[PDB]
Amino acid sequence: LLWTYSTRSEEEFVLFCDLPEPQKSPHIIQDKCTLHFLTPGVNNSGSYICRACCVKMILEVKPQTNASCEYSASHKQDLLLGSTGSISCPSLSCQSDAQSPAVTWYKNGKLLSVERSNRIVVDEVYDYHQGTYVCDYTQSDTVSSWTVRAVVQVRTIVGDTKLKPDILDPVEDTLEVELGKPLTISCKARFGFERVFNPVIKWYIKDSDLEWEVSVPEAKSIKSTLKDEIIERNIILEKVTQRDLRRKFVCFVQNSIGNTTQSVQLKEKR
Amino acid sequence: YFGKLESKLSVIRNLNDQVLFIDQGNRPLFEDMTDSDCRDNAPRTIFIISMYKDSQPRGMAVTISVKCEKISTLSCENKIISFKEMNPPDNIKDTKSDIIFFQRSVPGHDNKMQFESSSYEGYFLACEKERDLFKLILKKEDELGDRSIMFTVQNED
Amino acid sequence: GPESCTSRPHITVVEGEPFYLKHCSCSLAHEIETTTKSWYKSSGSQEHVELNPRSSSRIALHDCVLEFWPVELNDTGSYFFQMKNYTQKWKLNVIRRNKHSCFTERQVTSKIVEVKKFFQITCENSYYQTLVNSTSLYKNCKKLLLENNKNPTIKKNAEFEDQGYYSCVHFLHHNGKLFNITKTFNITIVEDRSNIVPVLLGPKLNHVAVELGKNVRLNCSALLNEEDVIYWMFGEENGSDPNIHEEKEMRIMTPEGKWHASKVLRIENIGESNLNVLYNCTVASTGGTDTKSFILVRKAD
Ligand SMILES: *[C@@H]1O[C@H](CO)[C@@H](O[C@@H]2O[C@H](CO)[C@@H](O[C@@H]3O[C@H](CO[C@H]4O[C@H](CO)[C@@H](O)[C@H](O)[C@@H]4O)[C@@H](O)[C@H](O[C@H]4O[C@H](CO)[C@@H](O)[C@H](O)[C@@H]4O)[C@@H]3O)[C@H](O)[C@H]2NC(C)=O)[C@H](O)[C@H]1NC(C)=O
Ligand SMILES: *[C@@H]1O[C@H](CO)[C@@H](O[C@@H]2O[C@H](CO)[C@@H](O[C@@H]3O[C@H](CO)[C@@H](O)[C@H](O[C@H]4O[C@H](CO)[C@@H](O)[C@H](O)[C@@H]4O)[C@@H]3O)[C@H](O)[C@H]2NC(C)=O)[C@H](O)[C@H]1NC(C)=O
Ligand SMILES: *[C@@H]1O[C@H](CO[C@@H]2O[C@@H](C)[C@@H](O)[C@@H](O)[C@@H]2O)[C@@H](O[C@@H]2O[C@H](CO)[C@@H](O[C@@H]3O[C@H](CO)[C@@H](O)[C@H](O)[C@@H]3O)[C@H](O)[C@H]2NC(C)=O)[C@H](O)[C@H]1NC(C)=O
Ligand SMILES: *[C@@H]1O[C@H](CO)[C@@H](O[C@@H]2O[C@H](CO)[C@@H](O[C@@H]3O[C@H](CO)[C@@H](O)[C@H](O)[C@@H]3O)[C@H](O)[C@H]2NC(C)=O)[C@H](O)[C@H]1NC(C)=O
Ligand SMILES: *[C@@H]1O[C@H](CO[C@@H]2O[C@@H](C)[C@@H](O)[C@@H](O)[C@@H]2O)[C@@H](O[C@@H]2O[C@H](CO)[C@@H](O)[C@H](O)[C@H]2NC(C)=O)[C@H](O)[C@H]1NC(C)=O
Ligand SMILES: *[C@@H]1O[C@H](CO)[C@@H](O[C@@H]2O[C@H](CO)[C@@H](O)[C@H](O)[C@H]2NC(C)=O)[C@H](O)[C@H]1NC(C)=O
Ligand SMILES: *[C@@H]1O[C@H](CO)[C@@H](O[C@@H]2O[C@H](CO)[C@@H](O)[C@H](O)[C@H]2NC(C)=O)[C@H](O)[C@H]1NC(C)=O
Ligand SMILES: *[C@@H]1O[C@H](CO)[C@@H](O)[C@H](O)[C@H]1NC(C)=O
Ligand SMILES: *[C@@H]1O[C@H](CO)[C@@H](O)[C@H](O)[C@H]1NC(C)=O
Ligand SMILES: *[C@@H]1O[C@H](CO)[C@@H](O)[C@H](O)[C@H]1NC(C)=O
Ligand SMILES: [Cl-]
């Protein structure tokens, strides 16, 4: 069995052991006898053995010159939760689907008997539809009728948010502080999921028209879920003094929708 | 420890839109009903979903009841579904309970609901076709994507 | 194969439609012995007249069913089945057909579908499936162009244009006469009804300074949904405390349709027991929970 891999700017690949009885079932990762190849180029090509019964695999790699069509499928695909989605084979997208050229699909190793077309059309998408999808099809030449393997990674995602972010911490518009002591105020903000995500979380200091920008320290994603993302960024005062009372410390946060601010006025515990 | 918070009048339905109801045999069943039939078959079709506080929070703690003649609460005791002749309790002096369920939305499907038992973890309220009728049973999560454990809760809010 | 018995006690049907009544405890398995099955009808105060199995009449009694070819306005009444160690009843109510239409208003099954989310109409029938000649789909009583097989279906991501009444008709022939079974769905499309996973504002652990004798007002705010509940836990299991009062929650809706809820815990005449003990506040949703703890520490620490 000889499989071909037509690489580009960014992709992935796998080679699983095929045998009559599912008895059990290098810098590149290995899991459940299914050896995976990450970021190769022109290197990862040749014969690979797995084991009396011996599963022979003669891999081949070559770079793709250019896309045969305008709407050439991605190797990273997104299925919206609760709607109708499709998992199209990148290696067979530009030919559309005149007649399915013997397409076999594999979701996380397991074969998909029903799906044999250029596309897997998922009627109603649920979280479990997520996974590594491998579309295989045989293409003949002079003597060898080698198979073509393409690996599409699909994720189940919720539609992009229609809401601006939320400042979790701080809440109170004031703060009891003792002068001559250090202070580190923390800004915690929750960001609704977006396909293209460019969040903003920064502190700034203002005294009427006067404004000072804080750049250090770096922001930190504390939690990332399906619906939201929490990022945190501190402000450090090595020694709070009388001047730090004349001004307000405002945390700024913004996503593709808009911005929300929480300004804290410092007061002494006294 | 559970503490009864509040209730809502709801109509529970499966994903093939079959209305949940308590028959004369006093057993919880599923059946195809027109809006008219569902209305005309009340109070059997209208359920009292009561929310509870939890000493160890782990999702929406809930009780499911029906006021046919008197109020009856849903029990999953001995992994078997039944309607016990009782009003939702004001307090439950235990971490786990045969009448308390965790009402949880399915990822990305915010209006589809799943009820896991607080007493038997891994087991959920589900609709299973047994012979000539659709029973409301309690079954262990066997395979990913099981749509028989999903439901829709139409509130009177 | 099998078929759902009519378990529901009250049944509404429209005149001129072939309708049936199937009793429960019906097992047609080869091991099952034959037995005497009786069907009776009641009209008004009391009747209890045994149903007539006349020579190919409008009413057909066989196996487990009471078929009607078709139901008419005068069929409304109380029906009863009797068997060895088994008795079932139903309250049949047959409503008038909307003649100046294709479907009757009352026999509608409403469904609300979210925009850009999977929408489907599957025109199926299994009981009368063997007798069905042709099947059609109607949007506001206007026929739909399709492949129109034994079951014409719709399968698309919902759009406000899909809102409407979908009459699903099944034409069949019964020993010469043509009948039809019509089942209409009242589909109404509605804008993103997506919920937020609730969250408590502020840090997860709070040390709230105070000295004995005085009172505290622990405030717990939450970003939640409309239907979500916010509560406090302070040892109700050990009995009731007459110094801890849970004030009525406050709710506001942010211009962008965001709900904020605030509930405060009043702790009157702080004693040594009220110290170094975790007073938890939590949010509860169908889509998640979040908990916050408030420890009462002496002002002297
Ligand atoms: C499923 O099966 C049922 C029967 O079980 C069928 O029901 C019949 O359907 C028709 C139409 O829905 C019923 O309505 C009758 O319509 C007549 C007028 O329709 C014509 O004229 C208008 C003019 O504007 C046209 O638009 C239209 O296309 C028609 O050409 C009315 O005249 C009838 O009213 C009364 O007067 C007549 C005499 O003129 C009497 O004979 C009638 O009895 C009645 O008193 C009436 O409104 C008809 O009533 C239904 N019959 C029965 C027995 O219920 C369904 O059509 C069928 N489903 C499908 C999809 O075919
Ligand atoms: C994949 O697609 C990319 C485009 O997205 C493609 O890149 C283009 O390659 C061609 C060559 O194959 C480039 O064009 C040539 O550029 C050289 C200078 O670098 C010129 O000397 C050439 O001029 C001659 O030919 C012209 C056209 O016939 C004549 O008009 C002229 O008088 C000269 O005789 C010629 O213009 C082109 O610049 C790139 N463009 C980009 C954006 O990369 C790439 O080659 C494709 N892959 C493969 C393997 O073909
Ligand atoms: C108030 O809340 C505390 C803490 O509760 C925990 O933290 C919150 C922020 C949430 O994440 C909660 O979901 C979570 O329960 C309650 O006390 C804590 O309870 C947990 C669960 O019973 C204890 O964990 C166990 O500890 C034992 C012994 O170490 C282990 O063997 C177990 O594996 C398990 O981890 C935890 O120890 C306990 N912590 C404290 C500080 O007591 C507390 O009961 C509650 N109070 C009231 C009045 O409701
Ligand atoms: C098809 O489904 C829709 C709902 O999706 C039903 O429409 C609803 O009908 C009522 C009719 O009264 C509408 O008005 C309401 O009336 C009450 C009367 O007490 C009043 O208090 C309310 O303020 C309101 O005005 C309601 O707005 C309407 N909703 C929508 C979204 O259309 C319709 O009845 C269903 N059809 C059938 C045949 O069942
Ligand atoms: C759908 O029905 C037609 C017509 O059926 C006739 O009319 C009915 C009201 C009832 O009286 C029936 O018994 C009649 O047969 C079917 O068309 C007939 O097909 C046969 C061959 O199968 C042919 O010999 C007849 O001439 C046809 N009748 C007419 C009026 O032309 C048709 O086959 C049915 N289709 C399906 C898919 O069930
Ligand atoms: C943050 O959001 C505010 C609005 O809430 C933005 O303010 C607007 O700015 C435009 C100019 O870009 C003005 O025409 C509007 O009048 C402003 N609105 C108000 C109410 O002041 C602000 O620009 C945003 N900031 C950033 C950094 O994007
Ligand atoms: C509990 O805290 C919340 C949040 O700080 C308070 O609620 C809001 O306070 C802001 C102050 O800027 C007002 O603009 C809002 O209108 C308030 N909203 C609500 C829903 O109340 C709340 O008042 C605090 N309660 C107590 C008693 O301290
Ligand atoms: C294989 O070749 C690629 C360049 O195409 C290189 O980056 C990689 O390090 C090589 N791997 C090994 C194992 O030599
Ligand atoms: C009921 O209505 C039908 C209409 O076709 C009629 O044939 C039948 O005789 C009526 N039955 C009685 C008891 O009047
Ligand atoms: C009568 O039927 C019920 C079930 O409906 C069964 O439990 C009972 O044992 C039966 N009794 C006899 C005498 O057959
Ligand atoms: Cl959010």
Which tokens in the block code for residue B101? Answer: 């369920």
Tracing tokens 């009459």 back to the chain, one arrives at C167
How far CA A70 is from CA of A75, A92, A216, B153, in Å, comes to 15, 13, 44, 45
* Residue B147: φ, ψ to 5°: -85, -5
**Rg (Cα) of chain B, in Å, rounded?**
15
Which tokens in the block code for residue C257? Answer: 């349709």
Measured CA to CA, the distance from residue C163 to residue C119 in angstroms comes to 11
Nearest partner of B36 among C20, C186, C139, judged by Cα: C186
Q: A63 touching B, CB under 8 A?
A: no
Nearest ligand 4 atom to alpha carbon C165: 1
Protein residues whose CB sits closer than 6 Å to any atom of ligand 6: A 254, 258-259
Find the closest chain C residue to B102 by CA distance. Answer: C286
Architecture of the CATH domain C1-97:
Sandwich (2.60)
How far CA A114 is from CA of A27, A78, A105, A120, C118, in Å, comes to 35, 21, 9, 9, 21
Which tokens in the block code for residue C49? Answer: 């007249």
By CB atoms closer than 10 A (0-12, 13-18, 19+), residue B110 is buried
Q: C109 touching B, CB under 8 A?
A: yes
Contact between chains at A228 and C258 (C-beta distance less than 8 A)? no
Contact between chains at C199 and A190 (C-beta distance less than 8 A)? yes
Tracing tokens 């999977």 back to the chain, one arrives at C118
How far CA A58 is from CA of A61, A102, A193, in Å, comes to 10, 20, 42
* Closest C-alpha residue for ligand 8 atom 13: A27
DSSP, collapsed to helix, strand or coil, labels residue A148 as: strand
Chain breaks in chain B (C to N over 2.5 A) after: none
Q: Find out whether B106 and B113 touch, Cβ atoms under 8 Å.
A: yes
How far CA B102 is from CA of C236, C283, C286, in Å, comes to 21, 14, 8
Contact between chains at C256 and A190 (C-beta distance less than 8 A)? no
DSSP, collapsed to helix, strand or coil, labels residue A244 as: helix
* Closest C-alpha residue for ligand 9 atom 12: C74
Measured CA to CA, the distance from residue B5 to residue C232 in angstroms comes to 11
CB of residue C105 inside a 6 A radius of ligand 4: yes
Residues 6+ apart with CB under 8 A from B69: none
Angle at B123 between CA B134 and CA B102, to 5 degrees: 100
Paired sense of beta strands A131-138 and A147-157, if any? antiparallel
Find the closest chain C residue to B1 by CA distance. Answer: C237
* Residue C161: φ, ψ to 5°: -70, -20
Residues 6+ apart with CB under 8 A from B8: B48, B49, B51, B155, B156, B157
Strand-pairing partners, residue A183, are: A237
Compute how many other C-beta atoms are within 10 angstroms of the C-beta atom of residue C4. 20
Q: What is the per-residue burial (b if ≥16 Cβ within 10 Å, else e) of B19-53?
A: bbbbbeeeebbbbebbbbbbebbeebbbbbbbbbb
Which tokens in the block code for residue A147? Answer: 């198979």
Pseudo-torsion of CA B90, C226, B157, B89, nearest 10°? -10
d(CA B108, nearest CA chain A) in Å: 5
Query: Nearest bound ligand to CA C252?
Result: 7
Strand-pairing partners, residue A119, are: A88
Which tokens in the block code for residue A80? Answer: 């919206």
Paired sense of beta strands C59-62 and C278-285, if any? unpaired
Mutate to test the pocket of ligand 3, among C199, C291, C294 (most ligand atoms within 8 A of CB): C291
By CB atoms closer than 10 A (0-12, 13-18, 19+), residue A49 is exposed
Matching CATH topology for A69-159 and A160-270? yes
DSSP, collapsed to helix, strand or coil, labels residue B8 as: strand
Which of 190-219 (A) contact C at CB < 8 A? 190, 192
Query: Nearest bound ligand to CA C71?
Result: 9
CB of residue A9 inside a 6 A radius of ligand 2: no
Which tokens in the block code for residue C24? Answer: 């429960």
CB of residue B35 inside a 6 A radius of ligand 4: yes
Nearest partner of C136 among C182, C95, C98, C169, judged by Cα: C169
d(CA B13, nearest CA chain A) in Å: 18
Centroid of ligand 8 to alpha carbon of A41 (angstroms):
8
Q: Find out whether A60 and A146 touch, Cβ atoms under 8 Å.
A: yes
Nearest ligand 5 atom to alpha carbon C133: 38
Nearest partner of C176 among C8, C37, C56, judged by Cα: C56
CATH topology classification for C98-192:
Immunoglobulin-like (2.60.40)
Q: Find out whether A94 and A74 touch, Cβ atoms under 8 Å.
A: no
Q: What sign has the CA pseudo-torsion C157, C162, C167, C172?
A: negative
Domain boundaries, chain B: 1-157
DSSP per residue, B38-71: HHHTTTTS-EEEEEEEESS--SEEEEEEEESSSE
**DSSP 8-state code for residue B77:** G
Which tokens in the block code for residue A33? Answer: 């006898």
How far CA C236 is from CA of B141, C149, C239, C242, C282, in Å, comes to 34, 63, 5, 11, 15
* Residue A219: φ, ψ to 5°: -70, 160
For chain C, how many residues are written?
301
Which of 22-61 (C) contact A at CB < 8 A? none
Half-sphere CA count of A260, side-chain side, radius 13 A:
21
The highest-level CATH class for domain C193-301 is mainly beta
* SS3 of chain C: CCCCCCCCCEEEEECCCCEEEECCCCCCCCCCCCCCCEEEEECCCCCCEECCCCCCCCEEEECCEEEECCCCHHHCEEEEEEECCEEEEEEEEEECCCCCCCCCCCCECCEEEECCCEEEEECCCCCCCCCEEEEEEEECCEECCCCCCCCCEEEEECCHHHCEEEEEEEEEEECCEEEEEEEEEEEEEECCCCCCCCEECCCCEEEEECCCCCCEEEEEEEEECCCCEEEEECCCCCCCCCCEEECCCEEEEECCCEEEEEEEEEECCCCHHHCCCEEEEEEEECCEEEEEEEEEECCCC
Residues 6+ apart with CB under 8 A from B19: B11, B12, B13, B30, B31, B32, B33, B38, B41, B45
Q: What sign has the CA pseudo-torsion A158, A164, A170, A172?
A: negative
**Across the A/B interface, how many CB contacts are shorter than 8 Å?**
21
Residues of B in contact with A128 (CB under 8 A): 144-145
Paired sense of beta strands C216-224 and C65-68, if any? unpaired
Which of 80-119 (B) contact A at CB < 8 A? 106-109
Matching CATH topology for C1-97 and C193-301? yes
Q: C196 touching A, CB under 8 A?
A: yes
Strand-pairing partners, residue A155, are: A78
Q: A227 touching C, CB under 8 A?
A: yes
Centroid of ligand 5 to alpha carbon of C138 (angstroms):
23
Paired sense of beta strands B2-13 and A147-157, if any? unpaired
Tracing tokens 């009583």 back to the chain, one arrives at C141
Mutate to test the pocket of ligand 5, among C149, C173, C175, C180 (most ligand atoms within 8 A of CB): C173
Paired sense of beta strands C10-14 and C86-95, if any? parallel
Nearest partner of A93 among A114, A112, A77, A113, judged by Cα: A77
Centroid of ligand 3 to alpha carbon of B107 (angstroms):
26
DSSP, collapsed to helix, strand or coil, labels residue B147 as: helix
Q: C117 touching A, CB under 8 A?
A: yes
Q: Find out whether C188 and C112 touch, Cβ atoms under 8 Å.
A: yes
Measured CA to CA, the distance from residue B25 to residue C180 in angstroms comes to 33
Measured CA to CA, the distance from residue A121 to residue A77 in angstroms comes to 13
Angle at C232 between CA C228 and CA C237, to 5 degrees: 120
Query: Nearest bound ligand to CA C134?
Result: 5
Order of strands, edge to edge, in the sheet holding C205-209? C205-209, C288-297, C278-285, C229-233
Q: Resolution of this PDB entry, in A? A: 3.1
Nearest ligand 3 atom to alpha carbon C233: 49
Domain boundaries, chain A: 1-68, 69-159, 160-270
Protein residues whose CB sits closer than 6 Å to any atom of ligand 7: A 171; C 217, 219, 221, 250, 252, 260, 262, 264
Order of strands, edge to edge, in the sheet holding A200-207? A174-177, A259-268, A248-254, A200-207, A210-213
Nearest partner of A35 among A60, A17, A59, A56, judged by Cα: A17
The highest-level CATH class for domain A160-270 is mainly beta
Residue in C114, C157, C256 nearest the CB of A163: C256
Amino acid at A266: L
In chain B, the largest separation of any two C-alpha atoms, in whole Å, equals 42
Strand-pairing partners, residue A136, are: A104, A149
Find the closest chain B residue to A82 by CA distance. Answer: B109
Angle at A58 between CA A54 and CA A59, to 5 degrees: 135
Paired sense of beta strands C111-114 and C142-143, if any? unpaired
Domain boundaries, chain C: 1-97, 98-192, 193-301
d(CA A108, nearest CA chain B) in Å: 14
CATH no. for A69-159: 2.60.40.10
* Residue A64: φ, ψ to 5°: -85, 130
Nearest partner of B49 among B35, B34, B38, B60, judged by Cα: B60
CATH no. for B1-157: 2.80.10.50
Q: B25 touching A, CB under 8 A?
A: no
Q: A155 touching B, CB under 8 A?
A: no
CB of residue B25 inside a 6 A radius of ligand 3: no
Which tokens in the block code for residue A205? Answer: 């200091």
Nearest partner of A250 among A177, A170, A189, A164, judged by Cα: A170
